[PDB]
Amino acid sequence: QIIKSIAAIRELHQMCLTSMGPCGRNKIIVNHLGKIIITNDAATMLRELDIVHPAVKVLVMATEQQKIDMGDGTNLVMILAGELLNVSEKLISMGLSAVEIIQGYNMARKFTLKELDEMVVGEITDKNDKNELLKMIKPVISSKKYGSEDILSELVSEAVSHVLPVAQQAGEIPYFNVDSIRVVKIMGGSLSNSTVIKGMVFNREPEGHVKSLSEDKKHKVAVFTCPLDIANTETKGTVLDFSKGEEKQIDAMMKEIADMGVECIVAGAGVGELALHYLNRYGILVLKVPSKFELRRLCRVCGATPLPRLGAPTPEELGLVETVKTMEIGGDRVTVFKQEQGEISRTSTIILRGATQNNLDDIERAIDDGVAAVKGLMKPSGGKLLPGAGATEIELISRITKYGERTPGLLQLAIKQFAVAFEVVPRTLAETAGLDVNEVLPNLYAAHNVTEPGAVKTDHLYKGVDIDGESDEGVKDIREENIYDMLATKKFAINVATEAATTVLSIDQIIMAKK
Protein backbone atom coordinates (compact mmCIF):
# COMPACT_ATOMS: atom_id res chain seq x y z
CA GLN A 1 0.00 0.00 0.00
CA ILE A 2 2.98 2.28 0.62
CA ILE A 3 3.90 1.90 -3.07
CA LYS A 4 0.42 2.86 -4.27
CA SER A 5 0.56 6.08 -2.24
CA ILE A 6 3.79 6.99 -4.04
CA ALA A 7 2.38 6.12 -7.47
CA ALA A 8 -0.54 8.50 -6.89
CA ILE A 9 1.89 11.34 -6.15
CA ARG A 10 4.11 10.19 -9.04
CA GLU A 11 1.30 11.08 -11.45
CA LEU A 12 1.57 14.73 -10.38
CA HIS A 13 5.31 14.50 -9.66
CA GLN A 14 6.45 14.66 -13.29
CA MET A 15 4.35 17.80 -13.81
CA CYS A 16 6.35 19.73 -11.21
CA LEU A 17 9.69 18.37 -12.46
CA THR A 18 9.26 20.43 -15.65
CA SER A 19 8.30 23.59 -13.71
CA MET A 20 11.32 24.77 -11.73
CA GLY A 21 14.21 26.26 -13.68
CA PRO A 22 14.60 28.87 -16.42
CA CYS A 23 14.02 26.21 -19.10
CA GLY A 24 10.85 24.98 -17.39
CA ARG A 25 7.56 24.62 -19.23
CA ASN A 26 4.00 25.73 -18.50
CA LYS A 27 0.82 23.63 -18.34
CA ILE A 28 -2.66 24.73 -19.43
CA ILE A 29 -5.44 24.26 -16.86
CA VAL A 30 -9.02 25.20 -17.75
CA ASN A 31 -10.81 26.88 -14.86
CA HIS A 32 -14.31 25.82 -13.80
CA LEU A 33 -15.60 29.22 -15.01
CA GLY A 34 -14.66 28.50 -18.63
CA LYS A 35 -11.42 30.51 -18.74
CA ILE A 36 -7.99 29.22 -19.74
CA ILE A 37 -5.43 29.93 -17.01
CA ILE A 38 -1.74 29.03 -17.41
CA THR A 39 1.06 29.76 -14.94
CA ASN A 40 4.44 28.50 -13.77
CA ASP A 41 3.71 28.65 -10.03
CA ALA A 42 2.52 25.28 -8.74
CA ALA A 43 0.70 26.69 -5.70
CA THR A 44 -1.79 28.33 -8.07
CA MET A 45 -2.16 25.25 -10.29
CA LEU A 46 -2.70 22.85 -7.38
CA ARG A 47 -5.70 24.91 -6.24
CA GLU A 48 -7.45 24.72 -9.63
CA LEU A 49 -6.80 20.99 -10.05
CA ASP A 50 -9.20 18.43 -8.58
CA ILE A 51 -7.25 16.05 -6.33
CA VAL A 52 -9.23 13.21 -4.74
CA HIS A 53 -6.14 11.54 -3.24
CA PRO A 54 -5.59 12.54 0.42
CA ALA A 55 -1.89 11.63 0.26
CA VAL A 56 -1.35 14.24 -2.46
CA LYS A 57 -3.06 16.90 -0.32
CA VAL A 58 -0.18 16.57 2.17
CA LEU A 59 2.20 18.01 -0.42
CA VAL A 60 -0.46 20.56 -1.38
CA MET A 61 -0.68 21.88 2.18
CA ALA A 62 3.12 21.77 2.40
CA THR A 63 3.29 23.82 -0.81
CA GLU A 64 1.19 26.57 0.79
CA GLN A 65 3.96 26.96 3.38
CA GLN A 66 6.27 27.98 0.53
CA LYS A 67 3.69 30.34 -1.00
CA ILE A 68 2.58 32.11 2.20
CA ASP A 69 5.57 32.33 4.54
CA MET A 70 8.03 32.67 1.63
CA GLY A 71 8.16 34.05 -1.90
CA ASP A 72 10.02 31.17 -3.57
CA GLY A 73 10.28 27.39 -3.47
CA THR A 74 6.78 26.37 -4.58
CA ASN A 75 8.21 24.27 -7.42
CA LEU A 76 11.18 23.13 -5.31
CA VAL A 77 9.13 21.63 -2.46
CA MET A 78 7.20 19.40 -4.88
CA ILE A 79 10.40 18.08 -6.48
CA LEU A 80 12.23 17.40 -3.21
CA ALA A 81 9.28 15.77 -1.43
CA GLY A 82 8.48 13.70 -4.52
CA GLU A 83 12.02 12.33 -4.82
CA LEU A 84 12.25 11.37 -1.13
CA LEU A 85 9.48 8.83 -1.76
CA ASN A 86 11.22 7.34 -4.80
CA VAL A 87 14.56 6.83 -3.03
CA SER A 88 12.67 5.33 -0.06
CA GLU A 89 11.39 2.44 -2.20
CA LYS A 90 14.87 0.89 -2.12
CA LEU A 91 14.74 0.65 1.69
CA ILE A 92 11.18 -0.73 1.67
CA SER A 93 12.19 -3.56 -0.66
CA MET A 94 15.08 -4.48 1.66
CA GLY A 95 12.59 -4.91 4.52
CA LEU A 96 13.40 -1.73 6.46
CA SER A 97 10.61 -0.27 8.58
CA ALA A 98 9.45 3.31 8.06
CA VAL A 99 10.76 4.23 11.53
CA GLU A 100 14.45 4.08 10.63
CA ILE A 101 13.64 5.77 7.31
CA ILE A 102 12.06 8.74 9.10
CA GLN A 103 14.72 8.65 11.82
CA GLY A 104 17.41 8.67 9.14
CA TYR A 105 16.04 11.84 7.57
CA ASN A 106 15.83 13.59 10.95
CA MET A 107 19.48 12.80 11.68
CA ALA A 108 20.46 13.89 8.16
CA ARG A 109 18.37 17.07 8.38
CA LYS A 110 20.31 18.38 11.38
CA PHE A 111 23.56 17.60 9.56
CA THR A 112 22.39 19.56 6.50
CA LEU A 113 21.01 22.58 8.38
CA LYS A 114 24.29 22.88 10.30
CA GLU A 115 26.31 23.02 7.07
CA LEU A 116 24.05 25.68 5.51
CA ASP A 117 25.62 28.31 7.78
CA GLU A 118 29.02 27.50 6.24
CA MET A 119 27.65 27.59 2.67
CA VAL A 120 27.23 31.39 2.84
CA VAL A 121 30.17 33.29 1.35
CA GLY A 122 28.83 36.77 0.66
CA GLU A 123 26.23 38.69 2.65
CA ILE A 124 23.77 41.32 1.44
CA THR A 125 24.40 44.65 3.16
CA ASP A 126 20.69 45.58 2.79
CA LYS A 127 21.66 48.90 1.22
CA ASN A 128 18.34 48.92 -0.70
CA ASP A 129 20.10 50.59 -3.63
CA LYS A 130 18.63 50.30 -7.12
CA ASN A 131 21.71 48.42 -8.32
CA GLU A 132 21.97 46.32 -5.14
CA LEU A 133 18.36 45.08 -5.25
CA LEU A 134 18.97 43.69 -8.75
CA LYS A 135 21.03 40.86 -7.24
CA MET A 136 18.30 39.41 -5.01
CA ILE A 137 15.32 40.18 -7.25
CA LYS A 138 16.70 38.77 -10.52
CA PRO A 139 16.75 35.05 -9.52
CA VAL A 140 13.25 35.28 -8.02
CA ILE A 141 11.77 36.86 -11.16
CA SER A 142 13.66 34.25 -13.20
CA SER A 143 12.44 30.78 -14.21
CA LYS A 144 9.37 32.42 -15.77
CA LYS A 145 9.08 34.04 -19.21
CA TYR A 146 12.80 33.60 -19.83
CA GLY A 147 14.49 36.46 -21.64
CA SER A 148 12.41 39.21 -20.01
CA GLU A 149 14.25 39.05 -16.66
CA ASP A 150 16.51 41.97 -17.62
CA ILE A 151 13.70 44.46 -18.26
CA LEU A 152 11.48 43.31 -15.39
CA SER A 153 14.41 43.65 -12.97
CA GLU A 154 14.44 47.45 -13.21
CA LEU A 155 10.66 47.66 -12.78
CA VAL A 156 10.53 45.64 -9.55
CA SER A 157 13.69 47.08 -7.99
CA GLU A 158 12.39 50.63 -8.48
CA ALA A 159 8.98 49.89 -6.94
CA VAL A 160 10.43 48.17 -3.86
CA SER A 161 12.79 51.09 -3.18
CA HIS A 162 9.77 53.41 -3.14
CA VAL A 163 7.86 51.30 -0.60
CA LEU A 164 10.79 51.02 1.81
CA PRO A 165 10.99 54.13 4.04
CA VAL A 166 14.29 55.81 4.83
CA ALA A 167 15.66 54.67 8.19
CA GLN A 168 18.91 53.49 9.74
CA GLN A 169 20.04 51.35 12.69
CA ALA A 170 16.48 50.14 13.39
CA GLY A 171 15.59 46.50 12.75
CA GLU A 172 12.67 46.09 15.18
CA ILE A 173 9.85 47.69 13.16
CA PRO A 174 8.90 46.06 9.84
CA TYR A 175 8.73 48.21 6.71
CA PHE A 176 7.89 46.40 3.46
CA ASN A 177 4.36 45.13 2.83
CA VAL A 178 3.18 42.71 0.16
CA ASP A 179 -0.25 44.26 -0.48
CA SER A 180 1.28 47.75 -0.85
CA ILE A 181 2.27 46.94 -4.46
CA ARG A 182 -0.59 46.47 -6.94
CA VAL A 183 0.18 45.55 -10.56
CA VAL A 184 -1.98 46.69 -13.48
CA LYS A 185 -2.17 45.29 -17.00
CA ILE A 186 -3.68 46.70 -20.21
CA MET A 187 -3.65 45.06 -23.63
CA GLY A 188 -1.50 46.85 -26.19
CA GLY A 189 1.96 48.36 -26.24
CA SER A 190 5.26 46.62 -25.56
CA LEU A 191 7.45 45.63 -22.62
CA SER A 192 10.00 48.43 -23.05
CA ASN A 193 7.27 51.07 -22.64
CA SER A 194 6.63 50.11 -19.00
CA THR A 195 7.55 52.46 -16.16
CA VAL A 196 7.32 52.82 -12.38
CA ILE A 197 4.84 55.24 -10.77
CA LYS A 198 4.31 56.04 -7.08
CA GLY A 199 0.64 55.56 -6.25
CA MET A 200 -2.35 53.45 -7.21
CA VAL A 201 -3.27 53.70 -10.89
CA PHE A 202 -6.99 53.73 -11.71
CA ASN A 203 -8.15 52.43 -15.09
CA ARG A 204 -11.72 53.73 -14.77
CA GLU A 205 -13.06 56.61 -16.85
CA PRO A 206 -13.39 60.04 -15.21
CA GLU A 207 -17.21 59.78 -15.69
CA GLY A 208 -17.48 63.59 -15.94
CA HIS A 209 -16.46 66.64 -17.93
CA VAL A 210 -13.41 67.11 -15.65
CA LYS A 211 -10.62 64.88 -16.95
CA SER A 212 -7.90 65.94 -14.49
CA LEU A 213 -7.08 68.56 -11.87
CA SER A 214 -4.37 71.23 -11.98
CA GLU A 215 -0.68 70.93 -11.09
CA ASP A 216 -1.08 72.60 -7.69
CA LYS A 217 0.20 70.52 -4.79
CA LYS A 218 -2.01 69.13 -2.01
CA HIS A 219 -5.33 68.50 -3.73
CA LYS A 220 -8.15 68.01 -1.23
CA VAL A 221 -9.72 64.57 -1.75
CA ALA A 222 -12.84 63.31 0.05
CA VAL A 223 -13.73 59.61 0.22
CA PHE A 224 -17.47 59.00 0.66
CA THR A 225 -18.76 55.50 1.37
CA CYS A 226 -22.43 56.43 1.07
CA PRO A 227 -23.58 56.77 -2.56
CA LEU A 228 -24.45 60.19 -3.93
CA ASP A 229 -28.18 60.86 -3.53
CA ILE A 230 -30.65 63.30 -2.00
CA ALA A 231 -30.04 63.98 1.69
CA ASN A 232 -32.23 61.71 3.82
CA THR A 233 -32.93 61.26 7.53
CA GLU A 234 -31.03 58.72 9.62
CA THR A 235 -34.22 57.94 11.57
CA LYS A 236 -36.84 56.34 9.27
CA GLY A 237 -37.11 58.62 6.21
CA THR A 238 -38.71 56.15 3.81
CA VAL A 239 -39.68 57.61 0.43
CA LEU A 240 -43.03 56.32 -0.85
CA ASP A 241 -41.55 67.24 -5.06
CA PHE A 242 -39.39 64.13 -5.56
CA SER A 243 -37.84 65.28 -8.84
CA LYS A 244 -37.55 68.96 -7.89
CA GLY A 245 -36.40 68.03 -4.39
CA GLU A 246 -33.39 66.06 -5.60
CA GLU A 247 -32.30 69.04 -7.72
CA LYS A 248 -32.22 71.56 -4.85
CA GLN A 249 -30.88 69.26 -2.11
CA ILE A 250 -28.02 67.71 -4.10
CA ASP A 251 -26.99 71.14 -5.39
CA ALA A 252 -26.90 72.38 -1.78
CA MET A 253 -24.82 69.43 -0.55
CA MET A 254 -22.29 69.75 -3.37
CA LYS A 255 -22.00 73.51 -2.77
CA GLU A 256 -20.86 73.13 0.85
CA ILE A 257 -18.13 70.70 -0.25
CA ALA A 258 -16.75 72.96 -2.99
CA ASP A 259 -16.68 75.97 -0.63
CA MET A 260 -14.07 74.29 1.59
CA GLY A 261 -11.78 73.70 -1.41
CA VAL A 262 -12.29 69.97 -2.04
CA GLU A 263 -11.56 69.30 -5.72
CA CYS A 264 -12.14 65.52 -5.69
CA ILE A 265 -14.96 63.32 -4.40
CA VAL A 266 -14.39 59.57 -4.09
CA ALA A 267 -17.63 57.55 -4.04
CA GLY A 268 -17.19 53.83 -3.40
CA ALA A 269 -20.80 53.14 -4.40
CA GLY A 270 -22.81 54.06 -7.47
CA VAL A 271 -23.13 57.69 -8.52
CA GLY A 272 -26.47 59.19 -9.53
CA GLU A 273 -27.13 60.99 -12.78
CA LEU A 274 -28.00 64.36 -11.21
CA ALA A 275 -24.74 64.34 -9.22
CA LEU A 276 -22.60 64.46 -12.38
CA HIS A 277 -24.29 67.66 -13.59
CA TYR A 278 -23.51 69.78 -10.52
CA LEU A 279 -19.90 68.60 -10.16
CA ASN A 280 -19.08 69.86 -13.67
CA ARG A 281 -19.86 73.50 -12.84
CA TYR A 282 -17.97 73.42 -9.52
CA GLY A 283 -14.85 71.89 -11.09
CA ILE A 284 -14.75 68.73 -8.95
CA LEU A 285 -13.16 65.56 -10.29
CA VAL A 286 -15.43 62.51 -10.33
CA LEU A 287 -13.80 59.30 -9.08
CA LYS A 288 -15.48 55.98 -8.29
CA VAL A 289 -13.87 52.98 -6.58
CA PRO A 290 -16.19 49.93 -6.75
CA SER A 291 -13.62 47.74 -4.97
CA LYS A 292 -13.82 48.13 -1.19
CA PHE A 293 -10.42 46.46 -0.75
CA GLU A 294 -8.63 49.35 -2.47
CA LEU A 295 -10.20 51.94 -0.16
CA ARG A 296 -8.26 50.62 2.84
CA ARG A 297 -4.92 50.98 1.03
CA LEU A 298 -5.97 54.40 -0.31
CA CYS A 299 -6.21 55.89 3.19
CA ARG A 300 -2.48 55.32 3.71
CA VAL A 301 -1.62 57.21 0.50
CA CYS A 302 -3.56 60.48 0.34
CA GLY A 303 -4.65 60.44 3.99
CA ALA A 304 -8.41 60.63 3.43
CA THR A 305 -10.90 58.77 5.62
CA PRO A 306 -14.15 57.11 4.50
CA LEU A 307 -17.37 58.73 5.71
CA PRO A 308 -20.46 56.51 6.17
CA ARG A 309 -22.69 59.60 5.98
CA LEU A 310 -22.98 62.26 3.27
CA GLY A 311 -22.84 66.05 3.36
CA ALA A 312 -20.38 66.42 6.28
CA PRO A 313 -16.92 67.29 4.72
CA THR A 314 -14.89 67.10 7.91
CA PRO A 315 -11.44 68.69 7.39
CA GLU A 316 -9.80 66.07 9.63
CA GLU A 317 -10.86 63.32 7.20
CA LEU A 318 -9.59 65.16 4.10
CA GLY A 319 -6.39 64.07 2.38
CA LEU A 320 -3.79 65.81 0.24
CA VAL A 321 -2.35 64.69 -3.10
CA GLU A 322 0.12 66.69 -5.17
CA THR A 323 -0.57 65.54 -8.74
CA VAL A 324 -3.66 64.04 -10.38
CA LYS A 325 -3.58 63.73 -14.17
CA THR A 326 -4.94 61.60 -17.02
CA MET A 327 -2.58 59.62 -19.26
CA GLU A 328 -2.95 57.05 -22.03
CA ILE A 329 -1.91 53.57 -20.85
CA GLY A 330 -2.12 50.78 -23.41
CA GLY A 331 -4.15 52.90 -25.84
CA ASP A 332 -6.97 53.96 -23.50
CA ARG A 333 -7.34 57.21 -21.56
CA VAL A 334 -7.11 56.56 -17.81
CA THR A 335 -6.83 58.87 -14.81
CA VAL A 336 -3.52 58.36 -12.99
CA PHE A 337 -3.15 58.92 -9.24
CA LYS A 338 0.40 59.71 -8.13
CA GLN A 339 2.58 62.22 -6.28
CA GLU A 340 6.15 63.52 -6.24
CA GLN A 341 7.83 64.25 -2.90
CA GLY A 342 5.63 65.40 -0.03
CA GLU A 343 3.25 63.04 1.77
CA ILE A 344 5.44 59.96 1.52
CA SER A 345 3.35 56.93 0.60
CA ARG A 346 4.23 53.24 0.85
CA THR A 347 1.98 52.22 -2.07
CA SER A 348 3.45 51.82 -5.57
CA THR A 349 2.13 50.54 -8.89
CA ILE A 350 3.95 48.73 -11.71
CA ILE A 351 2.45 49.44 -15.13
CA LEU A 352 2.65 46.65 -17.71
CA ARG A 353 1.94 46.60 -21.44
CA GLY A 354 1.77 43.83 -23.99
CA ALA A 355 -0.20 42.38 -26.87
CA THR A 356 -0.72 38.88 -25.44
CA GLN A 357 -3.27 38.69 -22.63
CA ASN A 358 -2.04 35.36 -21.25
CA ASN A 359 1.57 36.53 -21.00
CA LEU A 360 0.50 39.49 -18.85
CA ASP A 361 -0.93 37.10 -16.25
CA ASP A 362 2.37 35.33 -15.55
CA ILE A 363 4.37 38.57 -15.45
CA GLU A 364 1.86 40.01 -12.97
CA ARG A 365 2.08 36.87 -10.82
CA ALA A 366 5.88 36.88 -11.11
CA ILE A 367 5.99 40.36 -9.56
CA ASP A 368 3.86 39.22 -6.61
CA ASP A 369 6.30 36.35 -6.05
CA GLY A 370 9.18 38.77 -6.66
CA VAL A 371 8.10 41.32 -4.07
CA ALA A 372 7.36 38.53 -1.59
CA ALA A 373 11.10 37.79 -1.47
CA VAL A 374 11.64 41.31 -0.09
CA LYS A 375 9.88 40.20 3.10
CA GLY A 376 12.62 37.59 3.51
CA LEU A 377 15.31 40.30 3.51
CA MET A 378 14.73 41.12 7.20
CA LYS A 379 16.79 40.12 10.24
CA PRO A 380 16.07 36.33 10.09
CA SER A 381 18.93 35.53 7.68
CA GLY A 382 17.93 38.01 5.00
CA GLY A 383 21.44 38.96 3.94
CA LYS A 384 22.91 35.47 3.68
CA LEU A 385 23.01 33.73 0.31
CA LEU A 386 24.10 30.52 -1.39
CA PRO A 387 24.84 29.68 -5.03
CA GLY A 388 21.92 28.13 -6.87
CA ALA A 389 21.22 26.59 -10.28
CA GLY A 390 22.58 23.21 -9.19
CA ALA A 391 25.73 24.53 -7.49
CA THR A 392 24.73 23.89 -3.87
CA GLU A 393 22.77 20.66 -4.42
CA ILE A 394 25.84 18.89 -5.83
CA GLU A 395 28.27 20.29 -3.24
CA LEU A 396 26.08 19.12 -0.34
CA ILE A 397 26.27 15.53 -1.64
CA SER A 398 29.99 15.32 -0.84
CA ARG A 399 29.33 16.48 2.73
CA ILE A 400 26.44 14.07 3.32
CA THR A 401 28.35 11.02 2.06
CA LYS A 402 31.20 12.02 4.39
CA TYR A 403 28.83 11.80 7.38
CA GLY A 404 27.51 8.42 6.21
CA GLU A 405 30.62 6.43 7.10
CA ARG A 406 31.23 8.66 10.14
CA THR A 407 27.95 7.74 11.87
CA PRO A 408 27.83 4.01 12.72
CA GLY A 409 24.64 1.99 12.87
CA LEU A 410 21.69 1.35 10.59
CA LEU A 411 21.49 5.06 9.70
CA GLN A 412 24.16 4.56 7.01
CA LEU A 413 21.52 3.33 4.55
CA ALA A 414 19.29 6.37 5.02
CA ILE A 415 22.13 8.92 4.89
CA LYS A 416 23.45 7.64 1.55
CA GLN A 417 19.96 7.70 0.03
CA PHE A 418 19.47 11.19 1.50
CA ALA A 419 22.21 12.62 -0.74
CA VAL A 420 21.04 10.73 -3.84
CA ALA A 421 17.60 12.34 -3.48
CA PHE A 422 19.23 15.72 -4.21
CA GLU A 423 20.37 14.59 -7.67
CA VAL A 424 16.86 15.15 -9.06
CA VAL A 425 17.32 18.95 -9.03
CA PRO A 426 20.26 18.99 -11.51
CA ARG A 427 18.65 16.19 -13.53
CA THR A 428 15.44 18.13 -14.18
CA LEU A 429 17.46 21.22 -15.12
CA ALA A 430 19.28 19.14 -17.74
CA GLU A 431 16.10 17.49 -19.07
CA THR A 432 14.05 20.69 -19.31
CA ALA A 433 16.98 22.37 -21.10
CA GLY A 434 17.18 19.72 -23.83
CA LEU A 435 20.60 18.59 -22.59
CA ASP A 436 21.48 14.91 -22.33
CA VAL A 437 21.29 13.18 -18.95
CA ASN A 438 24.66 11.50 -19.59
CA GLU A 439 26.35 14.91 -20.11
CA VAL A 440 25.55 17.35 -17.30
CA LEU A 441 25.67 14.81 -14.45
CA PRO A 442 29.29 13.55 -14.82
CA ASN A 443 30.51 17.09 -15.55
CA LEU A 444 29.10 18.45 -12.28
CA TYR A 445 30.80 15.73 -10.22
CA ALA A 446 34.25 16.31 -11.74
CA ALA A 447 33.89 20.08 -11.21
CA HIS A 448 33.05 19.90 -7.50
CA ASN A 449 35.43 16.98 -6.77
CA VAL A 450 39.13 17.79 -7.27
CA THR A 451 42.45 17.00 -5.60
CA GLU A 452 43.97 20.17 -4.14
CA PRO A 453 47.37 20.02 -2.40
CA GLY A 454 46.14 21.96 0.63
CA ALA A 455 43.58 22.22 3.42
CA VAL A 456 41.83 25.35 2.10
CA LYS A 457 39.46 24.66 -0.78
CA THR A 458 40.44 26.31 -4.06
CA ASP A 459 39.35 26.69 -7.72
CA HIS A 460 35.56 27.21 -7.99
CA LEU A 461 32.73 25.64 -6.00
CA TYR A 462 30.20 27.91 -7.76
CA LYS A 463 29.76 25.67 -10.82
CA GLY A 464 26.06 25.32 -11.60
CA VAL A 465 23.86 23.83 -14.31
CA ASP A 466 24.25 25.89 -17.48
CA ILE A 467 21.38 26.51 -19.88
CA ASP A 468 23.89 26.02 -22.75
CA GLY A 469 22.26 26.67 -26.14
CA GLU A 470 25.16 29.10 -26.66
CA SER A 471 28.91 29.70 -26.07
CA ASP A 472 30.80 26.43 -26.67
CA GLU A 473 30.67 23.58 -24.14
CA GLY A 474 30.41 22.81 -20.45
CA VAL A 475 29.08 25.02 -17.68
CA LYS A 476 30.12 28.38 -16.23
CA ASP A 477 30.21 30.25 -12.94
CA ILE A 478 26.70 31.22 -11.87
CA ARG A 479 28.11 34.37 -10.23
CA GLU A 480 28.64 35.88 -13.70
CA GLU A 481 24.87 36.28 -14.13
CA ASN A 482 24.32 37.25 -10.45
CA ILE A 483 21.86 34.40 -9.87
CA TYR A 484 21.66 32.68 -6.49
CA ASP A 485 19.20 31.09 -4.07
CA MET A 486 18.51 32.98 -0.85
CA LEU A 487 19.35 31.03 2.31
CA ALA A 488 15.98 31.87 3.88
CA THR A 489 14.28 30.17 0.92
CA LYS A 490 16.58 27.14 0.73
CA LYS A 491 16.88 26.46 4.47
CA PHE A 492 13.13 26.75 5.05
CA ALA A 493 12.38 24.53 2.05
CA ILE A 494 14.41 21.64 3.50
CA ASN A 495 12.33 21.51 6.69
CA VAL A 496 9.11 21.55 4.66
CA ALA A 497 10.35 18.85 2.27
CA THR A 498 11.29 16.50 5.12
CA GLU A 499 7.99 16.97 6.96
CA ALA A 500 6.07 16.46 3.71
CA ALA A 501 7.65 13.07 2.99
CA THR A 502 7.48 12.11 6.68
CA THR A 503 3.68 12.26 6.72
CA VAL A 504 3.37 10.07 3.62
CA LEU A 505 5.82 7.46 4.93
CA SER A 506 4.13 7.48 8.36
CA ILE A 507 0.72 6.54 6.89
CA ASP A 508 0.58 2.80 6.19
CA GLN A 509 -3.22 2.64 5.79
CA ILE A 510 -5.99 4.86 4.42
CA ILE A 511 -9.78 4.58 4.46
CA MET A 512 -11.79 6.40 1.77
CA ALA A 513 -15.29 6.36 0.30
CA LYS A 514 -16.85 6.57 -3.15
CA LYS A 515 -16.99 10.17 -4.37
Binding site: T233, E234, T235, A312
Partner: protein, 78 residues
Protein backbone atom coordinates in the same frame (compact mmCIF):
# COMPACT_ATOMS: atom_id res chain seq x y z
CA UNK B 1 -13.33 44.65 34.08
CA UNK B 2 -15.62 47.11 32.27
CA UNK B 3 -19.18 45.84 31.89
CA UNK B 4 -20.72 49.01 30.40
CA UNK B 5 -21.06 49.33 26.63
CA UNK B 6 -18.88 52.05 25.10
CA UNK B 7 -20.60 51.78 21.71
CA UNK B 8 -23.05 54.32 20.29
CA UNK B 9 -25.97 55.03 22.61
CA UNK B 10 -29.43 56.54 22.21
CA UNK B 11 -31.68 58.71 24.35
CA UNK B 12 -33.46 56.82 27.13
CA UNK B 13 -36.80 57.95 25.64
CA UNK B 14 -38.04 57.42 22.10
CA UNK B 15 -37.18 60.35 19.83
CA UNK B 16 -35.81 61.14 16.38
CA UNK B 17 -33.18 63.18 14.57
CA UNK B 18 -34.70 66.19 12.77
CA UNK B 19 -32.15 68.30 10.90
CA UNK B 20 -32.45 70.70 7.97
CA UNK B 21 -28.71 70.61 7.18
CA UNK B 22 -25.91 68.15 7.89
CA UNK B 23 -24.37 70.56 10.42
CA UNK B 24 -27.48 70.34 12.61
CA UNK B 25 -27.31 66.53 12.71
CA UNK B 26 -23.93 66.53 14.48
CA UNK B 27 -25.42 68.75 17.20
CA UNK B 28 -28.24 66.28 17.87
CA UNK B 29 -25.87 63.31 17.53
CA UNK B 30 -23.43 64.81 20.05
CA UNK B 31 -26.22 65.04 22.64
CA UNK B 32 -26.42 61.24 22.83
CA UNK B 33 -22.61 61.01 22.75
CA UNK B 34 -22.37 63.03 25.98
CA UNK B 35 -23.54 59.95 27.91
CA UNK B 36 -20.47 58.03 26.74
CA UNK B 37 -18.09 60.99 27.06
CA UNK B 38 -19.21 61.56 30.66
CA UNK B 39 -18.25 57.98 31.53
CA UNK B 40 -14.89 58.23 29.74
CA UNK B 41 -13.88 61.22 31.88
CA UNK B 42 -14.42 59.22 35.07
CA UNK B 43 -12.33 56.30 33.80
CA UNK B 44 -9.29 58.38 32.82
CA UNK B 45 -9.31 60.06 36.25
CA UNK B 46 -8.69 56.70 37.94
CA UNK B 47 -5.45 56.22 35.99
CA UNK B 48 -3.88 59.52 37.07
CA UNK B 49 -5.22 59.10 40.62
CA UNK B 50 -3.16 56.01 41.52
CA UNK B 51 0.39 55.92 40.12
CA UNK B 52 -0.45 58.23 37.23
CA UNK B 53 3.02 59.70 36.68
CA UNK B 54 4.86 56.84 38.41
CA UNK B 55 7.16 54.83 36.11
CA UNK B 56 6.62 51.15 35.33
CA UNK B 57 2.85 51.53 35.67
CA UNK B 58 -0.04 50.84 33.32
CA UNK B 59 -3.81 50.88 33.03
CA UNK B 60 -5.61 48.34 30.83
CA UNK B 61 -9.34 48.26 30.06
CA UNK B 62 -10.92 44.87 29.34
CA UNK B 63 -14.38 46.05 28.21
CA UNK B 64 -16.06 42.81 27.16
CA UNK B 65 -18.59 44.82 25.14
CA UNK B 66 -17.85 46.76 21.97
CA UNK B 67 -15.95 50.00 21.41
CA UNK B 68 -16.98 53.03 19.36
CA UNK B 69 -14.42 54.51 16.93
CA UNK B 70 -14.24 57.74 18.97
CA UNK B 71 -12.76 56.09 22.09
CA UNK B 72 -9.80 54.68 20.13
CA UNK B 73 -8.09 58.08 20.02
CA UNK B 74 -8.98 58.89 23.64
CA UNK B 75 -7.39 55.72 25.04
CA UNK B 76 -4.37 56.07 22.73
CA UNK B 77 -3.23 59.37 24.26
CA UNK B 78 -3.05 57.79 27.73
Amino acid sequence: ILNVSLEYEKTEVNSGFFYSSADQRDKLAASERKFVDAKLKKIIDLKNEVCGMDPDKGFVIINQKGIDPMSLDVFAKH
